[PDB]
Amino acid sequence: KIFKPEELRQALMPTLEALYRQDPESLPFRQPVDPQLLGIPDYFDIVKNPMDLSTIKRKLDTGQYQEPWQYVDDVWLMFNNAWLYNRKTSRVYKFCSKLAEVFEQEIDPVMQSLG
Numbered sequence: 001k002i003f004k005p006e007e008l009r010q011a012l013m014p015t016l017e018a019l020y021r022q023d024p025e026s027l028p029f030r031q032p033v034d035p036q037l038l039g040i041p042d043y044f045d046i047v048k049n050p051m052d053l054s055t056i057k058r059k060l061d062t063g064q065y066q067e068p069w070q071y072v073d074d075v076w077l078m079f080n081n082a083w084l085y086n087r088k089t090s091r092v093y094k095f096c097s098k099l100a101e102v103f104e105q106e107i108d109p110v111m112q113s114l115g
Ligand SMILES: COc1ccc(CCc2nc3cc(-c4c(C)noc4C)ccn3c2NC2CCCCC2)cc1Cl
Pocket: 024, 027, 028, 029, 033, 034, 038, 040, 081, 082, 085, 086, 091, 092, 095
């Protein structure tokens, strides 16, 4: 099944917007983790493939997804990176858990509509 870039954008960008709408939970995710700025040199030792909302948005805007499960994969890579690196008591970790609940609800009917 072929998917057009604008078809993927029209279907999937509302689910990304739903994540941006989460406040405070989306705030640490709207831009890439910056280890130099945050003083965490070990970050890229642990997270070999960073992902964040702005990079997913750019990938959707520049047609880098050929199928919707590639978009889902990048959202879940965001989540898994954050659960992996951050302590379970931290804001980032608990915010990640909230985004995953939101995303699960938003993406389900959209994947049905795509087929
Ligand atoms: C309201 O929320 C917060 C407010 C302040 C803080 C401390 C500063 C801070 N700590 C992180 C951690 C990650 C991260 C992720 C994600 N995965 O691993 C790591 C590591 C990313 C950004 N951080 C930032 N910068 C801020 C976030 C908020 C908007 C502007 C930039 C924490 C949070 Cl929660």
